[model samples]
Target: SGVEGAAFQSRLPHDRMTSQEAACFPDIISGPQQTQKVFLFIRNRTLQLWLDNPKIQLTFEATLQQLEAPYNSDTVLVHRVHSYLERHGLINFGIYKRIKPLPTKKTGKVIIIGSGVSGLAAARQLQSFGMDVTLLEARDRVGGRVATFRKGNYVADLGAMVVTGLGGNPMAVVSKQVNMELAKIKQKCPLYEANGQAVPKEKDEMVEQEFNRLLEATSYLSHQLDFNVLNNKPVSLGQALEVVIQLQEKHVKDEQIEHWKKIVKTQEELKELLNKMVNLKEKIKELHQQYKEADITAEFLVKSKHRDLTALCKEYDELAETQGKLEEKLQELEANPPSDVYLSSRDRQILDWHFANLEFANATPLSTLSLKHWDQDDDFEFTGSHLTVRNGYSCVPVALAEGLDIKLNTAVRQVRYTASGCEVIAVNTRSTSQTFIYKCDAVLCTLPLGVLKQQPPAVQFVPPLPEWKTSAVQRMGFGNLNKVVLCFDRVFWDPSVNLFGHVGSTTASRGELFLFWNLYKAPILLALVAGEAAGIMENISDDVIVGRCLAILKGIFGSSAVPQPKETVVSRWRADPWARGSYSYVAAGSSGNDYDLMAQPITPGPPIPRLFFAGEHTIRNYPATVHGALLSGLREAGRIADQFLGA
Candidate 1:
């Protein structure tokens, strides 16, 4: 197995021979100077985890959560402050107390492709060490996925929302460094049917308190099962769950389970109530038809339609007007009742509470005293937040490059390495054939593993990628999401509410009013369709999407209040020939280590490494965020700079 370019040992499968050496140690500690060690450890562990258990789909998510805990809370500080701990090492340390090191060196030109946050961070780190670096970007911009769209005085983020784990993210770091205000925004829609069809009040608050207490108990239970407390003994998750179940039986009793049962039962009853409402409406129509045949007066018909008093009046008025518009509206509501009380949660309460109180201007959160809806012409007279950069995300690479050379709109048709060096053949927009024949010492490719795999048109690799690299790329996925922003002449939905979201596993068809919606500070509703559902909707035309959205609006608001969107904007990242998805996510079984295969640098030529890679897809801490891309670029840049410095 080691004979192939699989020169790197699979630090997995504990059943194999184990080595006990300092170099073999899974964990390493070093100053900022040990950048490579950090990169290697993070990259190797992330990929290995992904490869081992590709089904869990929790690899990246779990890693993110682990990183998030230390970054956001003082959980680690409560014990003792450690610089940074890689999860893989922590999980596998006892199993492989002794290990061996892979063959790696620290010298080369780091070429980072993509100007996203990860790339920027890696570039900055590498450049600070004084290395020669080059950054390549496909689009005219560099922000990758952190982009804001503008319409007059209103601004909205078409791509990214709040910086998750904001307390410790690079955005927070840069915000503080530049004295810029990093406004906080709720990450998800928080409005749903709860207390009196509005934000839950005191009762909801009480329920939330109870739930949080329960969650804390669960946490304590987890802590009790820690391997440390168990004297380094391992316990399966099933075993752990069984222990908790027995504990609950002994300590709590069936009271808690009974409460949950009532909640579930109530939820089922609510569903039936919705169906009955629609059924009742249907019966009313039949009775109305009978009255019509008898030529009964509208007054009698009103008395007959006893289901809804308000609807009865509307029905009478509609009959006098010789139209069923009002009746039809009522029927629509009857069929699509909102989720009942059982679905409400504490998360929604926060949004329902302060949405009306908060305000925004130019996509930036603003002081309540100074804010006004975009509909007020006078409000438009004043400037809003900082004017967006003209080139849009192009500013991203520009801000990050810091004088590093960059190639734009140049598509690499093929990448192959040989005895002499690696050659990258690409074509620019002009369709002119261009050759970047660099007899390099090493190569680092940072393209999305998903794209490289399907044999895309823009990029080509020479000497053919190694079979392992190909398999690894094929196994990883670059997931996609649809960003649809609809703008209207004026606000239609209530401004007090920030968003509405759908939670059912069923992916709503295009224009289906299901889970999510956000006011975006003005006359726009930003909708996000993620996963396979997003791919389906994204495949359709923008015009079709608009029609579907309008239909949904009609369904929710009824014909009388149907909102006519002025401008409909949709992004086709998935359809885009270049970028086929939004960002990377570990598909099921892609254990934590799947990313290592993609992060390792490739050699294009002899002695000196000439090629490098950087992007969100390559990093651990910040993958799937713009910050990750920026950080990756900076890291690569720093690596190159350091190499040059050493030279």
Candidate 2:
């Protein structure tokens, strides 16, 4: 077989074969069965090789020849090859490694489309390198989504609200450069139950501690599980939770028994106490069960109308079974068993809070989020706490745009590119009656992910984007996040609590005013509506939204105690044509390779790459973030410098 022969003769490992080598290697073999191993071997080999030497160059002809070995043009091998390489950090792989300084040779002018963080970042880098760069913005402003609104002394971020981390984040670096005041906001989240009562501080503290411990446990367990069973079959966060809990229970039980052996003086004494503990735990379990039954009865009696009692009974039966087993196992250990094995009401409350917060953070339900990559970015150390810009989040972008060639209200229509150069066709957004075309050596597109994912996308490609690029835009999910900032006549809520959330019966209700940020420094409260609820909110009027928010506020504070807000401000990111949503999320089946594909520059042919992509969506590790957008801009700028400016 071609693959075996290539593997046998090459001093390098079988995995070192380039795509062309693998594609051509398989052609040496005649039998389809023989080619099977050849195909798989080279695919794996090329991926490894690409990861090892991302900068290695391969021509289109070589790639086509290699792919033609086992199959013809009829096959989708080209797309497969590109997709595989991109997923494994290959394909257009130069950006993955550190960018080197360009040679003394001068580069051609570059046109940057969109004056957002990404566009400004790219322009800034290119301009610093002495390359002529121009910025085209659709809105009459430079900051794309990082918009700020202020009246009098009150200030609120209508777009990006936080500088997530300080260490190694480009936006954080900019904040320091611009002398923007970064205030530390504590993550003092208190869970508010559906009954409008705040969970006791002690219970909340217990839950918080256990929640962090469980998160650590889950992280370790995920690596173990992936290595052992889920090599390719990835698990959702929800599934990971189930496995982590079960394993943690067993681990806790073993540890508790070991501790008991050390503490107990005699087996007789331990056995007697264990029995007594079991009896007491059983009584507690019965009491909890009785309370649950009584609540169900009360719900049925209170509602004179028809209701789904069948579902109510079914839920109770399942809860009863699990509750019984938990109570029984909890009593098997000493009175104070390991939290992992014997979950207290406090522990359960914390777990619920943790999961709820996860949904809020990612703007997606746990069942649809990938556990493997959700926290991949958590490896970074936080040098400083989460902070808000005193001037506004947009200051970073505003500062980056100083003295730059930025054209506002110029909406790009099409980007036509070839190996030689690129041409941008845009229209005057202020007066859609006018259109303009500009030619440049290259064009960097910094459009939002939501805009790119639209059906008749905002900007079209002359020859149309390749299948891989189009597929990537579809694979990545664009999520919505909305904020309703209500300005009060007076401070009505607790000033001590910075954040609060209400427990709801359904997921929809959970997202409706699910999270509230009390800006105690100002006479304002910010209500965050995310996910499906945000989508619903996008269609309603301001009065409707304000009413619903006020209702939730009344529930928290007494109806009579809290007065109507003097003014209400709402964010309509979803409804905004330029920015269809807040940010991006890795969808259920996506492994985050889509972001990589989106980041790669469009190089249809050899000599000169013409069209480049840089935006928050292009960055996998930091998608839908200001830092991600800033870094993405710098990344593309570096790529262009290396490719065009280098000798």
Stretches of candidate 1 exceeding 4 Å from the true structure: 1-110, 123-132, 176-181, 187-398, 401-404, 418-422, 432-444, 456-458, 503-522, 554-562, 604-610, 641-644
Residue lDDT tens for model 1, 530-620: 5335666766788887776666555455566756677778876666665666766544224235556666555544554455666666665
Worst 10 residues of 2 by lDDT: 89-98
Give candidate 2 misplaced runs (Cα > 4 Å).
1-107, 206-221, 227-234, 242-353
Q: In candidate 2, residue 235 scores what lDDT?
A: 66
Report lDDT (Cα) of residue 422, candidate 1: 52
Error of 1 at 492 (Å): 3.3
Q: Give all candidates' CA lDDT scores.
A: 0.46, 0.69
